[PDB]
Amino acid sequence: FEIKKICCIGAGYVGGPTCSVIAHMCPEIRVTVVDVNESRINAWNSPTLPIYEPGLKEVVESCRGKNLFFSTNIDDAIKEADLVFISACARRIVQNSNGYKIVTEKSTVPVRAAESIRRIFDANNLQVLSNPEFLAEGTAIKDLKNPDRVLIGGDETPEGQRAVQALCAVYEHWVPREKILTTNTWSSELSKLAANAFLAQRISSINSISALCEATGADVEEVATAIGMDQRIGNKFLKASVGFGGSCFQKDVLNLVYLCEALNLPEVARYWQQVIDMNDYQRRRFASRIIDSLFKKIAILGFAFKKDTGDTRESSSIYISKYLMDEGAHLHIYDPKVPREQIVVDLSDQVSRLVTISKDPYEACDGAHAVVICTEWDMFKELDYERIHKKMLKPAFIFDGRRVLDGLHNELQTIGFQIETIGKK
Amino acid sequence: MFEIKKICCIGAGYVGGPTCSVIAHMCPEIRVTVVDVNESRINAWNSPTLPIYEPGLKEVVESCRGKNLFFSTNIDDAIKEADLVFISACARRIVQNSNGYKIVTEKSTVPVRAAESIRRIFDANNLQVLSNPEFLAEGTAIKDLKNPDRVLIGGDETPEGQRAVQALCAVYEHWVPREKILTTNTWSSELSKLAANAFLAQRISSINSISALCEATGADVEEVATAIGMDQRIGNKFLKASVGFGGSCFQKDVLNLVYLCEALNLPEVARYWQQVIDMNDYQRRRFASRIIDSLFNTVTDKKIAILGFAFKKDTGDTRESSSIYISKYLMDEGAHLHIYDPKVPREQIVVDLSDQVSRLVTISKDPYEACDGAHAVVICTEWDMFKELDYERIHKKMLKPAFIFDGRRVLDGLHNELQTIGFQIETIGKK
Ligand SMILES: O=c1ccn([C@@H]2O[C@H](COP(=O)(O)OP(=O)(O)O[C@H]3O[C@H](CO)[C@@H](O)[C@H](O)[C@H]3O)[C@@H](O)[C@H]2O)c(=O)[nH]1
Ligand SMILES: O=c1ccn([C@@H]2O[C@H](COP(=O)(O)OP(=O)(O)O[C@H]3O[C@H](CO)[C@@H](O)[C@H](O)[C@H]3O)[C@@H](O)[C@H]2O)c(=O)[nH]1
């Protein structure tokens, strides 16, 4: 089998970038990204893409209108396509499909998503594959062009392996055969689920150590360095923070917990639950340190769940902000890429009285008792801190929840700041 | 400044012995004296049969022994003679035999604030206290010591502290690059070692938890672990599902971490790390249950072969070995065990399982003697010899139906051969 036309149902953070790179690497393949949201689809064909992703616009504009298309005409793209990506929806596929088509699930949860889709297709010639994304937001384009591995799951039948290899053929345009893993549908789903849980666990583990460091007068970045030098552990994903965010980590871990309880594995359920427990603890612990240090205007720098994205889903900034609002604080929030109205939505009255969304970081710190850094945006370490201290109410506090002001502690102290940082007394 | 010319090590064990042998080997100008109250052990060090099995140790020991490496029971003399004293109540004996400037260095991971307690004694009576935890793993101790990922040295941030720290750095710099040596304060060094072992143990419990999920859902844990391991942010090491981790350090370190957290009023951090131990104990009970269940829910007076008693391969160490627990779980159900391990001494196995041992336990000289007339064979240690055994011969003299319980994934790739021979193979992380 040969794939010549690809439809993707979902023009989001996964759907959008993935297809843009596919169209970019496979000029012979016509890629049509479709969405019910016309506002989003228009923004894709606009010069201002609906999502911020470094290098995406360049990639999109390279192949757009040539082999990459963004449309709201869903039924047509489904009918036209040889492979349908999914980033109840299986029903709309059936109504507009004839003959042989490959239906591929990219989303991590629900856990047995591909198994449920295949269930519908039998209740009515479609092939169901599992192909989870491994890209992280902020580095999506770089991850998609050179991934650590590609994971494709399909039935161990002649028709299943035929569809699997048809999808492998697409990736082999730019991904080495050595990096592509093929397996059954479930092993692929379980593998993605477990991988994200291992990743989230690393953060909770180093965050738990950061609490131990604050309590004992050690430095978590010093400890993390020593831990990271063991090649059996590795040096990546050991950066202590206010807490992990994103649409996937907490959702995946919780879905893992539910599967375990569904399978009568309560110890495995309690084992992975601790990853979430520790994360929520780290957040409460950080907010408490802020309230406690302030015996009031507060500047919140960074609202995205990580840098280089406008995504705010499950961002620790949301929780820290809400924890302070519940104590009656007046917040001034700045984020370089997060849209104003998204911040308002996230915090909902209470928002009307307490929350102000600033256009620039200096506007936010103007007349603030304290500045709280929740997202590791690079611009934050290059700000004029003498200028900020100037227009700040005194005593002026800095709460660094991302360790971005490291190396500036001497400068900031002599300026007149009282700096509080995660994982350090 | 300062130069170290004589080193005494109080402790001739798995850490003390190999460490000093490599130091003497790399620093011919330094006289290294390993001392112990146990004369039997000290004699064994000067004997052609070293008291511990460690690949390449005898070659290293015999290279520098009697030249700059010495094993003695004369503790007080070696302490008095030494510029640096290694420790692998003992600070009292150091004081009684020390004068002037000496550096006292703690190598043991727990008690958590060991170096802080030693320093406390020295002030209650010119000694410098350092922290220098080992990072070697047993079985690969010599290879780890000659090329470690990093060396960690902790000392006081005082002029005298940094002078002692750099004096110890000077020793390692004979064969360890400056780029791999980390210097910090005493506590940050102690905490770093404690946390590192906890991260390592956690990786095993995490992959073991997934192995349970695989058995329940018909996935393969080695397939899953491969996919996880290809992410460079996670890494591919320490992702081997097993019956459970053992060793003197992992459970002890994690439990000591839990106690420190509760002592510091951090109960959530305590419960977070406790799960690493909970999962490990679970994996063990789960494996033993799978054995009892596969044998018609009764193993009383049924002969069972236990292959491997060491907590890992290439060592004779049995401390906290999962083999101990699986063995005891089966003995409690009345099974007759035949235990074989290539390097674990017979009497150590007997001690570990204590009557009950007299009636149920037999220690075999070779693996075929153990499987002779057994209903089931249980592989608990990943010894390389186990994958190269004559399995047609074993099936021959085995009571039938013959079961194989592979708790280390060492019989992978042999499943086809073993099934056609007539075995029913049960393996961890696979339905
Ligand atoms: O050392 C670290 C690394 C990350 N984080 C935080 O953890 C969260 C997750 O970040 P990241 O994993 O980089 O972003 P995601 O886009 O959520 O990526 C994850 O989720 C994706 C969608 O499922 C997967 O494809 C990726 O493999 C997986 O890394 C973010 O809030 C980070 O700030 C830390 O606190 N410390
Ligand atoms: O992927 C793996 C790796 C190890 N293990 C088991 O975990 C236990 C620990 O083994 P290992 O860590 O290899 O041996 P140790 O001699 O206990 O070494 C540990 O303990 C030492 C003393 O603190 C440290 O210096 C080392 O860095 C640390 O690895 C053993 O039972 C292994 O079989 C697994 O089950 N799966």
UniProtKB/Swiss-Prot annotation, chain A:
It comes from Homo sapiens. One of its GO terms (biological process) is chondroitin sulfate proteoglycan biosynthetic process. Optimum pH is 8.6. Changing R403H: In DEE84; uncertain significance. InterPro entries: 6-PGluconate_DH-like_C_sf, NAD(P)-bd_dom_sf, UDP-Glc/GDP-Man, UDP-Glc/GDP-Man_DH_C, UDP-Glc/GDP-Man_DH_C_sf, UDP-Glc/GDP-Man_DH_dimer, UDP-Glc/GDP-Man_DH_N, UDPglc_DH_euk. Residues 106-112 are annotated as: Allosteric switch region. Homohexamer. It comes from the Eukaryota. Changing G243R: In DEE84; uncertain significance. Changing A113M: Stabilizes the active conformation of the hexamer. Decreases affinity for UDP-xylose, but not for UDP-glucose. Disrupts hysteresis and cooperativity. SMART domains: UDPG_MGDP_dh_C (SM00984). Detected in heart, placenta, liver, pancreas, spleen, thymus, prostate, ovary, small intestine and colon. Widely expressed. Belongs to the UDP-glucose/GDP-mannose dehydrogenase family. One of its GO terms (cellular component) is nucleoplasm. Changing C248 to A/S: Loss of enzyme activity. Changing I41T: In DEE84; uncertain significance. PANTHER family: UDP-GLUCOSE 6-DEHYDROGENASE, UDP-GLUCOSE DEHYDROGENASE/UDP-MANNAC DEHYDROGENASE. Keywords: Acetylation, Allosteric enzyme, Carbohydrate metabolism, Disease variant, Epilepsy, NAD, Oxidoreductase, Phosphoprotein. The gene is UGDH. It is linked to Developmental and epileptic encephalopathy 84: A form of epileptic encephalopathy, a heterogeneous group of severe early-onset epilepsies characterized by refractory seizures, neurodevelopmental impairment, and poor prognosis. Development is normal prior to seizure onset, after which cognitive and motor delays become apparent. DEE84 is an autosomal recessive form characterized by onset of refractory seizures in the first months of life. This is UDP-glucose 6-dehydrogenase.
